[PDB]
Design a protein around this ligand. Structure first.
Ligand SMILES: [K+]
Ligand SMILES: [K+]
Ligand SMILES: [Mg+2]
Ligand SMILES: [Mg+2]
Ligand SMILES: [Mg+2]
Ligand SMILES: [Mg+2]
Ligand SMILES: [Mg+2]
Ligand SMILES: [Mg+2]
Length: 52
RNA sequence: AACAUAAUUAAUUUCUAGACAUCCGUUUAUGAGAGGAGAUAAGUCGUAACAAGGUAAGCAUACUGGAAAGUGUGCUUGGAAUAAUC
């Protein structure tokens, strides 16, 4: 899922709300939280920030 | 070369990339040298034209000649024969 979101931001393409939802749901470790925090930041600064 | 993401406010992205390459040509200038016209203006050689200009003049064309010109063939009068009679 991380790869899918990374490609979209590189191409300046919108990311789905379902995509960020799947990431947060499948957090399995303390380290994963840190990565999700970065992607929540990226989602906020993206065209579909309102759809969180 | 023209799709793809996204969508419980709605929008993002694509909507391109080479080859502007020299032409075939066309004008004008330069002019080795070879000519033409015109004028300058005292000559030189003849005397061709103007008188029937001393071979009437001229046109076309051909040939010929220092030069004007000469000669042939056809044509012109822009020559003449001012004009009663064996
Ligand atoms: K003569
Ligand atoms: K004459
Ligand atoms: Mg004479
Ligand atoms: Mg004579
Ligand atoms: Mg004469
Ligand atoms: Mg003649
Ligand atoms: Mg002769
Ligand atoms: Mg003779």
């Amino acid at each position: 899922l991380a790869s899918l979101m990374d490609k979209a931001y590189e191409r300046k393409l919108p990311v789905s709300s379902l995509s960020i939802s799947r990431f947060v749901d499948n957090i399995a470790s303390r380290e994963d939280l840190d990565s999700a925090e970065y992607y929540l930041y990226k989602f906020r600064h993206s065209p579909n920030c309102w759809y969180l």
